């Protein structure tokens, strides 16, 4: 099971708002079955994806859903830890929205390291994700450290936060919440 290089993680998940990092998107994913009150994980149902040749990571996750062989009779929670949202292209959120409409046994939780508020398409795309049932939030220390511990080739090294991580996360979270306020 393949683990990310540590500089790739740090370079892509850094939440400095003064950086406009839109070239790549890294999406770390885990799928759990909701049963017996608890959650049940599957290690072959965890991994990470980047954009590959114009096909956004979010779309690459949707392409591998069949290979997950989800029992349509059960409820599943898919979590994404994604370096930024929402997916920039037009209708790429629409493809996510559509997948959620056709797979009503799947609940999608999106934890983004950052968002880019353009006061336009970006806000509308985030709202449409919410409206299709996704739960979108901004990553905090706990989630960066989880992803470090879970997806990165860290060789026993502990997570080392960058300067401003918590301040930046709280500022982004405030703005996402404002956008998504019902």
From Swiss-Prot:
The record's induction entry says: Phorbol 12-myristate 13-acetate (PMA) induces overexpression in keratinocytes. Up-regulated by IFN-alpha.
Where are the catalytic residues? Answer: 58
Give the UniProt subcellular location, in the record's own words. Nucleus
What range(s) does the CMP/dCMP-type deaminase domain occupy? 21-129
Q: In which tissues is it expressed?
A: Expressed at high and moderate levels in peripheral blood leukocytes, spleen, testes, heart, thymus, prostate and ovary. Also expressed at low levels in several other tissues.
Q: Where does Zn(2+) bind?
A: 56, 87, 92
Domain of life, per the record? Eukaryota
Sum up the protein's function in the record's words. DNA deaminase (cytidine deaminase) which acts as an inhibitor of retrovirus replication and retrotransposon mobility via deaminase-dependent and -independent mechanisms. After the penetration of retroviral nucleocapsids into target cells of infection and the initiation of reverse transcription, it can induce the conversion of cytosine to uracil in the minus-sense single-strand viral DNA, leading to G-to-A hypermutations in the subsequent plus-strand viral DNA.
Indicate the quaternary assembly: Homodimer. Interacts with APOBEC3G. Does not interact with APOBEC1.
Into which family does the record put it?
A: Belongs to the cytidine and deoxycytidylate deaminase family.
Q: What else is known?
A: It is one of seven related genes or pseudogenes found in a cluster, thought to result from gene duplication, on chromosome 22.
Written domain comment of the UniProt record: The CMP/dCMP deaminase domain 1 mediates RNA binding, RNA-dependent oligomerization and virion incorporation whereas the CMP/dCMP deaminase domain 2 confers deoxycytidine deaminase activity and substrate sequence specificity.
Can you say what this protein is called? DNA dC->dU-editing enzyme APOBEC-3B
């Amino acid at each position: 099971r393949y683990l990310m290089d540590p500089d790739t993680f740090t370079s892509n998940f850094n939440n400095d708002p003064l950086v406009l990092r839109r070239r790549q998107t890294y999406l770390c994913y885990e799928v759990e079955r909701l049963d017996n009150g608890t959650s049940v994980k599957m290690d072959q149902h965890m991994g990470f994806l980047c954009n590959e040749s114009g096909r956004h990571a979010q779309l690459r996750f949707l392409d591998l859903v069949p290979s997950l062989q989800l029992d349509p009779a059960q409820i599943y929670r898919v979590t994404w830890f994604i370096s930024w949202s929402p997916c920039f292209s037009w209708g790429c959120a629409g493809e996510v929205r559509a997948f959620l409409q056709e797979n009503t046994h799947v609940r999608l939780r999106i934890k983004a390291a950052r968002i880019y508020d353009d006061q336009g398409r970006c806000q509308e795309a985030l709202q449409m994700l919410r409206d299709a049932g996704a739960q979108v939030s901004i990553m905090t220390y706990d989630e960066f450290e989880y992803c470090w511990d879970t997806f990165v080739y860290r060789q026993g090294c502990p997570f080392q936060p960058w300067d401003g991580l918590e301040e930046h996360s709280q500022a982004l979270s405030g703005r996402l919440r404002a956008i998504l306020q019902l």
